[PDB]
Design a protein around this motif. Structure first.
Motif, PDB file in Angstrom:
ATOM      1  N   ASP A 348       0.870  -1.178   0.000  1.00 47.05           N
ATOM      2  CA  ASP A 348       0.000   0.000   0.000  1.00 47.05           C
ATOM      3  C   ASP A 348       0.909   1.230   0.000  1.00 47.05           C
ATOM      4  O   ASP A 348       1.477   1.621   1.024  1.00 47.05           O
ATOM      5  N   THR A 396      -7.280   4.531   0.571  1.00 45.22           N
ATOM      6  CA  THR A 396      -6.717   4.900   1.863  1.00 45.22           C
ATOM      7  C   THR A 396      -6.377   3.626   2.621  1.00 45.22           C
ATOM      8  O   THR A 396      -6.927   2.548   2.349  1.00 45.22           O
ATOM      9  N   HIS A 397      -5.478   3.780   3.595  1.00 42.67           N
ATOM     10  CA  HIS A 397      -5.085   2.683   4.461  1.00 42.67           C
ATOM     11  C   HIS A 397      -4.896   3.271   5.845  1.00 42.67           C
ATOM     12  O   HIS A 397      -4.329   4.362   5.982  1.00 42.67           O
TER      13      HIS A 397
END
Ligand code: NA
Length: 441
Positions: A348, A396-397
């Motif tokens: 990510d 998003t993370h």
């Protein structure tokens, strides 16, 4: 019978805008008279009609001889895209009891008893009225949703359909979904005017405007499956759309809102660094029963062309390669991922704004695409490295960078490719431009 055939065969009026002229394309050749201050603006698939509040701002359709679609108990359907600005709290207090027509086949202040139909607005209500040749009336009154972020009369293009079955009910649909109904049995013959008038009638707010697109009439009461097909038929995939439903544009400031977390805004940690979500403040007004997350906070993004070699179009097409910038402190800063840049678990990839470390490749080729959720005015963004390998869709993370607080941080990830059929997905973005039809109270 085949739905596309039914929709085509039953159309008796269909306004199109081509070469900056409004005309009827149904095949019945009704005359369309455009008055001087009827304006053309971007629409759902081309341009749309825009009406402001003066006597010169009108479009009149003089029906062809051959089309009597709604006399003597004939069933009929009217459809059109509609865009109405979000009514300010002040204007709900001042004008909320003022009902004004925007489309009508009723002739008023003349010999006629005024029979026909009308579409009208009153505050945050959308109203359908029928009046028969004896002057008897039936109405549908649709009260819009209180959350204006998700409401239908709150500055987004929405698709209206009103069906009229003389042996049962009139039924109002918005975006293919039944929203209101009234029994109409007992009404007699409808003897409407030879003209259908698109005009603000008896609107007391000088600053009011509306936009109308794809105005169409059918000589049957469409059923739900027909209306669903009709609605989705207009959602052309050529150009991407902004939050309001208008074509997405190059070189234009947009605020980004994740569809899956719509009460979040995007913020920048620092130039060269990462972006993350914050909670948007809300406006609430219980007395008026309205509320909404406030718009226009957070970063301003700009979409630029990646390396144009053909014609310059102002609109962004699905599949276009782009460079995404943040407009911050009077400059534009590229968004991308540096080679070997910080990432969560190597997959990510944390986006960076204005990254400029010498000697480090910065991957910044993006593709603006529409991969999912046809009815929603959202966009996905795909990032590539210098060998044109996918670094992922922008999403998003949740995690932390160094000693910073836990945040929902903007990333690119290929994880999303395995989940494109999900109802809600964190790679879907609304691009929201500042617009005169939405001012926070
Ligand atoms: Na994640």
């Amino acid at each position: 019978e085949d739905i596309d055939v039914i929709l085509k065969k039953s159309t008796i009026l269909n306004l199109d805008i081509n070469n900056d002229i409004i005309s009827d394309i149904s095949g019945f050749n009704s005359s369309v008279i455009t008055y001087p201050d009827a304006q053309l603006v971007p629409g759902i698939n081309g341009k749309a009609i825009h009406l402001v509040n003066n006597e010169s701002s009108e479009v009149i359709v003089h029906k062809a001889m051959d089309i009597e679609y709604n006399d003597m108990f004939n069933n009929f359907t009217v459809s059109f895209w509609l865009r109405v600005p979000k009514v300010s709290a002040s204007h709900l207090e001042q004008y909320g009891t003022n009902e004004y027509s925007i489309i009508s086949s009723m002739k008023k202040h003349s010999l006629s008893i005024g029979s026909g139909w009308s579409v009208s607005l009153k505050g945050n209500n959308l109203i359908w009225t029928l009046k028969d040749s004896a002057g008897e009336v039936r109405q549908i009154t649709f009260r819009d949703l209180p959350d204006k972020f998700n409401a239908y009369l709150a500055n987004k293009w929405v698709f209206i359909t009103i069906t009229n079955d003389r042996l049962s009910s009139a039924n109002l649909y918005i975006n293919g979904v039944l929203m209101g109904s009234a029994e109409i049995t007992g009404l007699g013959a409808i003897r409407e005017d030879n003209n259908i008038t698109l005009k603000l009638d008896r609107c007391n707010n000088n600053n009011q405007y509306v936009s109308i697109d794809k105005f169409r009439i059918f000589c049957k009461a469409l059923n739900p499956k027909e209306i669903e097909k009709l609605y989705t038929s207009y959602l052309s995939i050529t150009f991407l759309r902004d939050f309001w439903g208008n074509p997405l544009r190059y070189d234009t400031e947009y605020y980004l809102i994740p569809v899956a977390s719509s009460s979040k805004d995007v913020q920048l940690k620092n130039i060269t660094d990462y972006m993350y979500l914050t909670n948007a403040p809300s406006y609430t007004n219980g007395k008026l029963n309205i509320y909404y997350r406030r718009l226009y906070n957070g970063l301003k993004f700009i979409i630029k062309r990646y390396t144009p070699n053909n014609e310059i179009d102002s609109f962004v097409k699905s599949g276009d390669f782009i460079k995404l910038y943040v407009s911050y402190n009077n400059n534009e800063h590229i968004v991308g991922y540096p080679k070997d840049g910080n990432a969560f678990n190597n997959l990510d990839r944390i986006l960076r704004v204005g990254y400029n470390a010498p000697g480090i490749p910065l991957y910044k080729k993006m593709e603006a695409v529409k991969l999912r959720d046809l009815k929603t005015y959202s966009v996905q963004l795909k990032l590539y490295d210098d060998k044109n390998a996918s670094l992922g869709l922008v999403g998003t993370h949740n995690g932390q960078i160094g000693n910073d607080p836990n945040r929902d941080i903007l990333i690119a990830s290929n994880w999303y490719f395995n989940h494109l059929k999900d109802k809600i997905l964190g790679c879907d973005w609304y691009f929201v431009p500042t617009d005169e039809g939405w001012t926070n109270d």
